[PDB]
Paper text:
Aducanumab is a recombinant human antibody that was derived from a blood lymphocyte library collected from a healthy donor population of elderly subjects either lacking signs of cognitive impairment or with unusually slow cognitive decline. From this structure, coupled with epitope mapping and binding kinetic studies using synthetic peptides, we show that aducanumab binds to Aβ residues 3–7 in an extended conformation. Our studies clearly show that aducanumab selectively targets the aggregated species of Aβ and that this selectivity is based on very weak affinity for monomers and the avidity effect of the bivalent mAb and repeated binding to species with high density of available epitopes.
To understand the molecular basis for antigen recognition, we crystallized the Fab of aducanumab (AduFab) and solved its structure at 2.1 Å resolution. The key interactions with the Aβ peptide are formed exclusively through the complementarity-determining regions (CDRs) of AduFab, with the major specificity-determining contacts contributed by CDRs 2 and 3 of the heavy chain (H2, H3) and CDR 3 of the light chain (L3), and a minor contribution by L1. Aβ binding causes only minor conformational changes in aducanumab, which are largely confined to CDR H3, indicating that antigen binding requires slight accommodation by this CDR. Aducanumab has a very shallow and compact epitope-binding cleft that makes fewer interactions with the Aβ peptide. The shallow and compact epitope for aducanumab is consistent with its low affinity for monomeric Aβ, which in turn, potentially provides aducanumab with distinct advantages over other high-affinity antibodies.
Residue numbers in the entry:
A (entry chain L): 1 to 211
B (entry chain H): 1 to 139, 146 to 225
The structure:
């Protein structure tokens, strides 16, 4: 099998910026490499085939180069419709393999998250489960760290989080983290805290409540 | 006009079977190789299988060998994927794509035309409507609704019957270890507004015919 390593996995840029994406093959695949663009909820769209051949109708600001193991996709000046995820694909031998993808996102100024914590409702507690929610709102960049502490015990493995896509009007992100406990474990403890780390904050921000 | 129309996806239990169809129009179907490519939720593209233009040579990724069968009916201009012995990891959007091929042997070259995809969900969970719990605001304030323990996707969430849109963030669903999905929808409002303004999240889970209007108040 031929592994295709794509880098970087993500990048932020502005309109008019030049963008370079790299795909590396585990062995020589000659020029049998293709580049695809994909937007959320949409099928992939072919941009370049045979390493350097533009698919008909693809704007000329897209270009591809390389042969053997090293390949590059270049957008000479980024346009608003170019913010998407890009995939490389070797077509040299089966099994056909794709790169892990490169997500091109919008560049903006740092914005710290507004943090809120939500205790479980009494309604849910009658069901036998307690969900505690921490909301990180309208921040940039996307990377943020959330730590759950119950009576100063770090919670690990009992939380899930999801992140929105960049807001259309301000390009911020929002993140929610849900800590799931049984009702018995929730009633056994008092202090519930969500500690947020972000580059917009000079030191971690903790929001908490006492049951 | 070149078209690849897909169908046949659905929600099934592990061990069960599905058959996907990809009906082509607007080109010489019998002169193209055809691929199946899948994309699990939030993941990348994974090649599944290919079939030659004349239906002779077929190739598969290792994880579907002996379970999936690619085939084509050139008289109907249709490509198929018989998916047997399904596993939870087979959950993905499945795309078909044409490949003109290269060489006298006609090995894969590039995929220039794609179907829009059909969704396959493999899970031992059964259909269940969600419970809607409030995310009450306390002491610019944030509130929302926790739409927990439903299957399958999707649910829709609006606020105040569509009349409240700005400040609203409806997060992507997460799959819990129970096999049930959960998502949260939040909205920020001015702190002053809370005393008089009314706030209701409108939750609709069509697969279970569950419709819930939940009002969110300060506790």
């Amino acid at each position: 099998d031929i592994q295709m390593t794509q880098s970087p996995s993500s990048l932020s840029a502005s309109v008019g910026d030049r963008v370079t994406i790299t795909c590396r093959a585990s062995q020589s695949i000659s020029s049998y490499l293709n580049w695809y663009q994909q937007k959320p909820g949409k099928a992939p769209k072919l941009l370049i085939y045979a390493a350097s051949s533009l698919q008909s109708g693809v704007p000329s600001r897209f270009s591809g180069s390389g042969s053997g193991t090293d390949f590059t996709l270049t957008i000479s000046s980024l346009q608003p419709e170019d913010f998407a995820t890009y995939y490389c694909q070797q077509s040299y031998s089966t099994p056909l393999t794709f790169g892990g993808g490169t997500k091109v996102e919008i560049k903006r100024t740092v914005a710290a998250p507004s943090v809120f914590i939500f205790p479980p409702s009494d309604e849910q507690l009658k069901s036998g489960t307690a969900s505690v929610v921490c909301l990180l709102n309208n921040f940039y960049p996307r990377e943020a760290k959330v730590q759950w502490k119950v009576d100063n015990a770090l919670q690990s493995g009992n939380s899930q989080e999801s992140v929105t896509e960049q807001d259309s009007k301000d390009s911020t992100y929002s993140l929610s983290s849900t800590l799931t406990l049984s009702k018995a474990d929730y009633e056994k403890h008092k202090v519930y805290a969500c500690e947020v780390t972000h580059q917009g904050l000079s030191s971690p921000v903790t929001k908490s409540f006492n049951r | 006009q070149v078209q690849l129309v897909e169908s046949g996806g659905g929600v099934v239990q592990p061990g069960r079977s599905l058959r996907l169809s990809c009906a082509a129009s607007g080109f010489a179907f019998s002169s193209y190789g055809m691929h199946w490519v899948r994309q699990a939720p939030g993941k990348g593209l994974e090649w599944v299988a290919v079939i030659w233009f004349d239906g002779t040579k077929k190739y598969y990724t290792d994880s579907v060998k002996g379970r999936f069968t690619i085939s084509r009916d050139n008289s109907k201009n249709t490509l198929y994927l018989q998916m047997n012995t399904l596993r939870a990891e087979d959950t993905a959007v499945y795309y078909c794509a044409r490949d003109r091929g290269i060489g006298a042997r006609r090995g894969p070259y590039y995929m220039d035309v794609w179907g829009k995809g059909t969704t396959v969900t493999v899970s031992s969970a059964s259909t269940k409507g969600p419970s809607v719990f409030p995310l009450a605001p306390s002491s610019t304030a944030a509130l929302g609704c926790l739409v927990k323990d439903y299957f399958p996707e999707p649910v829709t969430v609006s606020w105040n019957s569509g009349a409240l849109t700005s400040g609203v963030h409806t997060f992507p669903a997460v799959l819990q270890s129970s096999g049930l999905y959960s998502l949260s929808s939040v909205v920020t409002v001015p702190s002053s507004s809370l005393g008089t303004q009314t706030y209701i999240c409108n939750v609709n889970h069509k697969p279970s015919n569950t419709k819930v209007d939940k009002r969110v108040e300060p506790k």
